[model samples]
Target chain A: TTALVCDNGSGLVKAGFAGDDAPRAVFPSIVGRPRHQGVMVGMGQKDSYVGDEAQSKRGILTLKYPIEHGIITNWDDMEKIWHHTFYNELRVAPEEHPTLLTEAPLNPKANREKMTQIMFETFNVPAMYVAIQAVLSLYASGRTTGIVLDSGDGVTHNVPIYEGYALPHAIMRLDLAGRDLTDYLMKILTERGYSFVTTAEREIVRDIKEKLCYVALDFENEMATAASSSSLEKSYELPDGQVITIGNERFRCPETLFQPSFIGMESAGIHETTYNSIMKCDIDIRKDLYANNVMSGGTTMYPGIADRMQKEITALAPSTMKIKIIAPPERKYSVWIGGSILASLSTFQQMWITKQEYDEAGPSIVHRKCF
Target chain B: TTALVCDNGSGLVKAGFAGDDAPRAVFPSIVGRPRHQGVMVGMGQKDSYVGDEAQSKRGILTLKYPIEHGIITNWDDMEKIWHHTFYNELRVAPEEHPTLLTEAPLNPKANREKMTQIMFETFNVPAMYVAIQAVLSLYASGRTTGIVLDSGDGVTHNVPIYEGYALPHAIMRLDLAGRDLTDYLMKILTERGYSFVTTAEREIVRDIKEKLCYVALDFENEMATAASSSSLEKSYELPDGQVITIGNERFRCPETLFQPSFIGMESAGIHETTYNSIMKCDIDIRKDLYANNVMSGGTTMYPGIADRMQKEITALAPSTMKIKIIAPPERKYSVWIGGSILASLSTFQQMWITKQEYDEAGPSIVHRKCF
Candidate 1:
């Protein structure tokens, strides 16, 4: 029997073979709890708490959302989340096979070391290996000139996959996606006299936005009309018999993605930010690369994203350049698809470190292999 | 020449004829800003912005707050705040004449008028009255009792002027002050890991709980021990280079004022909910006079109040007697001390609603006044 290890984010998708089994997938993001009442904790065998379950029991338990914004800050809580979310799920029992995890591009050296140490000392995994996004993308694709857009909840990131390997320099990270959108919606809801709303209720509002709300290419005029057209805005009756109204004001909420200035922040639009990330690597690669950019993650479900993204990018790209925007056939599960493909290899053994290397050389060995 | 009038929330403290140079003082039945952010609005004058300024241009502008806990609700923009705060500070612009403003006891009927008809048209006072709190207290002292315990914040209020007029029952309204402490704090700070923590050069984190922090009475021991022994229980580092460690084992933020579960809400030391408001009304002239309990406007200013309010009240009163916690103090401004004794003559005129009857009828005529 074999096992699999998976580490994911809003940007890159990474997974590895456990010798025989399918790879597991998780976004190293989205750890938050409701601030209201009702809390419960889960113990192991003791039926330990993990993932979405832990999130459900958020307010009650002392939830430690370890990997925030793609890095570990508080070691203690971070370890707790990792232990329950990964080690417990694998049922490793400190007697498991070698493990492989994924890390971001040009990750700070300190972060890499700390992660390796935790995996070795805490879980005592027989072996471990930290791989780069570029390599994982390459291995997942078996060498296809693909553009991967991992638009997870926290932020949206793009990594270029050539021949199944992610090109290190071709990674672009932009801080705007599901979470910001959720927060923006909440702010707008509150401003519109819907003050009793909670984080849990926000999920529904976000769904509403994704299902019915959208972005307009020529937003300025439409937004102006919507903002001034008091009765033209949309209103939803809440569960408690209250009604809240939302508008098409370019600056109301959605327009912030296009123009961060609407929210009093500075950020280049996704199109320009993505183009810049790719251009920074190999300007020549920009040719066919623009033709195959793939959008994935929960955010890809936003109603008008396909058209909005295509139109915005086209405006920023060279007039003569051609580009196409497409969502992965199964955007939400594509990362798992990539993970499955990456794990189906025999030579993958060389990619991971064994228990002996970890015990003797310590976690310091992680940096050496990835470099 | 002209007559002046004033309204107080505790009891309508109306005095003088509108034609008199020295007008009657008042304590409006409302709440005031606990802390001043310095002149909130100007005619493009001071380095300040009004309503929107406090929330939008938050860090950039010196804030001036009004209507602390309650709201006119539609003031997301500075238009209302600008007009009100500025106009009020301008001292009624009485110009020089008989001035009268309306006062509220419960305000249920008046507030609804704002929704039903044109507000200025419904409340026929040519001049608007800010005499809700002050007027009520004066009525208590003149008609029934004398003293009043005005518990505006979450603390214990003791107004012992007379038997029923200014006793603990009349002027005390401490049901729920800053009880929503955890809710508000988490909403503003913790949820986003202070994603709003921009500009490391300034000190935003220190204000997280230090300058702006409070602790519960029951949790004081744990907090103290944590402080002394260095406990990491609820320690969160502020971006401003300050660290705050809390010991919140299992205390949920409060939802209702008199629910059974709410009694167990906060520990340490607790106080009475209606410790002072209900104690003000006298029984002789008005056996049920205290029914008109004036509320505060601002959100409670006391810190860590939930931790001890219920316990304190339960301990002080008999088991058979139930304490009635009133609605919020006029979050807008409850003329606590701005009554006949201490208030300015000119400013007092804004509180009275009818100039023709104030001087000829005195407090008697004032009580019959509308609004």
Candidate 2:
């Protein structure tokens, strides 16, 4: 009865109808098929597996990620994912409802056009709206003027929005995020003679990071504390019936967000990147950018992240400028939440680029309509 | 003539006979072919162009970079470059010479094998040796125990070498380099409506960076100085007879190597990367690593870079430990110089992986012989 909302990321896809409290379907954005590509589509139940279903048959099926670093690099595989999200996951016909899709900042115009074509021609949706994830995230915080510090599984984004419009030139995107932290953890574990080589073992490392890692208030002090204090160490049990002790690694891995030098990277930390992104804007808006900064994405869920960011950014930023990081309870689903709120509004019903308009104006209309 | 020493990089190639005081030939490692690919090879001697020759017909030819970020990513174009370096540049027959080719640290084992295979099977060389560029660069500093910070067109490498042996795990590689600085400078100029989008205009930007850029000893102070002082501004004449003014961007662009946050990146600075790299080594060897620190590649030619690096690194590094950066007169030609020195030595002659040895052992033998 309402518009459908599809929010996809490099690591996961979250989908639900507009006005929903939470996403009805959340799963990995990967596609898996039998190792041999020789399979019939309608002859049997199994043609391709998507999301959790693909992850379920991890060993037997050849899993392929359709979305890489927030871009739809594999179009064919992405169509499969989109197909499953409509029919299998949401159990709905796309033709009956208007759709809203979330996209990353600075996404190529060509990609937006392709999505529009797919939604209008393939799915035969009545209407569609492509929204930038950062814009939606800032909206989720209930602010039209702010900076969004989004660190997800693939990449981190320092996006500044002014009166609901994002400044592309001022946006800062970074490769250091949730996945990098997981990798740093794996590297830390390797030194202790615990090598995680298998695919399932890699998942175990991710679980360890999500379960144990926390940002440190003072990296040096905490590092010393972790090294000397055995009480800070926690044990994680492996599926093979063995336990592994985690100490300084718990804090050190997440420290990469503040001090990327820990992982031998040469980029500035999240705090500096946020400050730099604000500085790229006009001096008049910088104060608003700093004071209303919003935090979103799964990586922002780490404990003490906001506090640590606030502390470091205050040191780097000018003395007079006020800085604040707004992280709401549903920060992880900020993009989806905003999309849900937007599409549910009666005012937005007239704003969608209708199927009839798309037929005449074509895909190029997405830029004009979305912006 | 002595054995051929060929050192190729993403931007340039330096080749000459072993033991020469300087490279007999130096040119960019790019290949150029006419816009139309239908032209026959050796037809009127106009099939393809290379290096300076490729650059000569810049407007009419399609310039292709065979090497990307210090790796040979395009085999066919690279073969053309190697062939030109042999016949047109060095004027030597491959069959009559033993070759020493330089490589980057952490290069894939498969790539080295491919290089070995090509040298023996394609070039028909009598003997060949693949040398890691960092080791050769350290050798060029006239020291076997040191950390070589080699920043070139594509990337920056902080490599630790202990008695001619490079510690691969401790090596730090960053994407920030000469090209990044040039691009950053271009970005700074864009605010004044001076956009360098054309290929020839891009060359002017590179010239501007090479001629005007300098690292500031104190970034904040210099930024203020550049802002208030009118005397620091210099004018550059573009090819179109337009004079553009340069000011703080000189210090600002180079500042990216120290504070990448200036460019809105999230990686740590070069100083931190160097300090982290040194810390990765054995504690017993760290003091030695700090004492003999070396600087190589064209990017290090920036005025006061060594001084700035020393200043910043000393602040982050251990106070008791000594930090030294060696920037020899021929630092840009460091890799070739080391190869020249090694290949000419009578005692090292037996170190070459001979064709006869390759015939018996295959490509796997390269890792053993080179390592």
Candidate 3:
């Protein structure tokens, strides 16, 4: 029996079959409801749109994310998101496949119980296994121990996993993330006489951050010459046909993550956060931890981000400790890759919380079986 | 036929044969060279001592720690420490047994390569395997995935391990730890008209910290009413026949971990650090991370520390996410137990970097075989 791997990230849902290197379907976590009238066009479902279709007809729809901070708070909408991913995107019959879904580290037992109930009772799945997304990210890296620095659309987290288990007490979080960066970029662009007020405009701003902005290796050095010289500047053309010459703003925006207090948040820089995570454990593991650092999520891919992190972390770490950051080729899909690997293992078959077992033992079995 | 597990921690080295739940030998990482002559007790060796014997006669000895920050820095002293552990304490012929030694996460390749060389050449070990201490702690817990919070004498670290692999990049480290707590308590006692100036006296201060000190849930509230009442006060009688009464000092000492700034260090509280670590990761794994928080370290045994951490972390976490802190019965022995479990496994035989393989491929073989 084949297993379906679902990496339900905050910004996107990456779904595919087991053993695949990458997910076959990657779609936004947000669901959209059609705003314009009479656009049904013989479709089987209601006017609500998901994924590409939702983005394509942007002006005619209002987007909403069902999951927040990786927890399913809105069950009705979350169900719709899952249905869309499983039925529409992956084109799989839930009843035919055993599903492996990735989840947040500190997910409540009640939520997982609800998830098992929904997957079995509603989706009629044959089997189900819920994996921690960070552990899956580590599995994707061919390791079961390491720290996962995940910066994505929802939030930023430094999660330490030992032998596939996440240390909940030592986890660190920051409210600032890809979404925050996008908003900051939007604000700066708006302040610089380039105002695009539409929802489509926001996408353009996001594109600018992805394409133009980069994490400065030396923020002070870059900032010193950024304004005086036009070398660091890049021109971005907006939907309104205005050319915005972005210079230091590019690096300055991402710098918020390094120094969140600049944006008025009382949080340590990502580097300090990482160091603090290592410090929370015994010194015996610190050196190994410094060596197998992995970077995942959408926001971690910015140019020079890892390099800058290395420099910042090295300064803080002892000379004896080695610092190596591993950012996989497709970091945004790392969790999906991990889920894919986990689902394909022969030994993994026993790990699944089968529908029959779920029916027999109920939801609490998930707590016992999954970990 | 049998395996030897060596949990070479920063403060101590715990060594023993496999299949045992607890280590047969546990001693400080320090090696003391006796200054006084004729202390060899008819033995044909230099005037040096290790472990319990070394500490008992500290008056005429110069103490040195072989490992620093979990990495072997002083090779000369380290070699002596290992020799003492193997020959004197465990009393095993190193050449007869397969060895499974634990190393710090991010331990330099060169150090490990040297260790492998020393094990195979100097000790003439039959087979050797080096495991991450944090991953071993997870193994000890019968888990392959979880976060390991290890607070010991030298440093406190929060490590994330995934399926027996450590995440080096997201590790958090703080300069303050169990030793720092002892020093702080000593300083406060000295300031409060109590003085003890000896190495043995330092142990007494440590005992006081261990016996009387506890983490205050509300530091400010405790401090507010501490002097007004004698209920919070406890008396500790030193070996010098002096009794010192302590009230807020008990909680205040351990509180340094929660609020390092209280001790004049600029860093986030343990709860905030844990929160920051979670935030640095992708949103999808935060819940699982929050749920599987494991506390494995000596300092974490403070009465209200885990409770305070739970209360603080819960306040920071979303209402839907559950926070459970797993502080094992003996925090200090967690790694040793893990090593015992790993060494005892029949399947683990294949994973060792054999002496035969080492003789053929040299020290580099360790990099390929061990995590």
Largest lDDT belongs to which candidate? 2
What fraction of the reference structure's interface contacts does model 1 contain? 0.00
Candidate 3 local lDDT, A1-371, one digit each (tens): 68888877776888889877777888877777866576656876567777777777767677777776555777887888888887778788999999998766544456677888889988989888888767777888888778888877766777887766556657665557887888788887766677756556676788888999898888889999986788988887765586778888999889988987565554578999999989987667788789989999898989898899899889999988889999877898888888888888887778978777877876668878443
Stretches off by above 4 angstroms in model 3 are A36-46, A161-168, A196-198, A369-371, B1-371
**Model 2 clash pairs?**
A266-B267, A266-B268, A267-B266, A267-B267, A267-B268, A268-B266, A268-B267
* Model 1 C-alpha lDDT per residue in residues A1-371, reported as the tens digit of each score: 34455665532233444433334434333345433344445522222344566546543333344554566666775565566555545444544655556655545788978877777777777666666543444344443775766666555677886544457656777667666776666655543335323344654566556655666656767666764677547667665587666666323456666666544355776677777776775677776677777776676765566787888778778788878876645566555444445544666657567767767887667766442
> For residues B1-371, could you state the per-residue lDDT of candidate 1 as single tens digits?
34334432121222344333333332222222213355446544454343322334444443332223332323232233323332443344333433333333223232323422222332233333344453444432343433323333232233334443223123322223442433334444554344432321122432343244543455556446655764435656654467654433212232223232344332122133343333323334322323322333333333444335535555665575543334333323333323333234654544454435433443333334342
lDDT of 3: 0.78
DockQ of each: 0.03, 0.02, 0.01
What lDDT does each candidate get?
0.47, 0.81, 0.78
Could you tell me every candidate's TM-score relative to the true structure? 0.52, 0.52, 0.51
Q: Residues B89-137, candidate 2, lDDT per residue (tens digit)? A: 8778999988998877767788888888888877889898888777788
C-alpha RMSD of each candidate structure in angstroms = 20.5, 22.0, 23.1
- Model 3 interface root-mean-square deviation: 22.0
Q: Write the per-residue lDDT of candidate 2 for residues A1-371, one digit (tens) a residue.
A: 68898888877889999878899999988777786467766687586777887777766677677766666778888888889899998999999998899876655466778878888777889988888788788767787899898878876887888877657668766767787788788888987889986544566798899999888899889878877878788998986699988888888888888777676554678888887888878778888888987989999998998898888879988899898988888888999999988888777777789877888877767877533
RMSD of 1: 20.5
Better by TM-score, candidate 3 or 2: 2
Q: Each model: TM-score of chain B?
A: 0.36, 0.92, 0.89
Identify the runs in model 2 with alpha carbons over 4 angstroms from their true place: A1-371, B35-47, B163-166, B262-265, B369-371
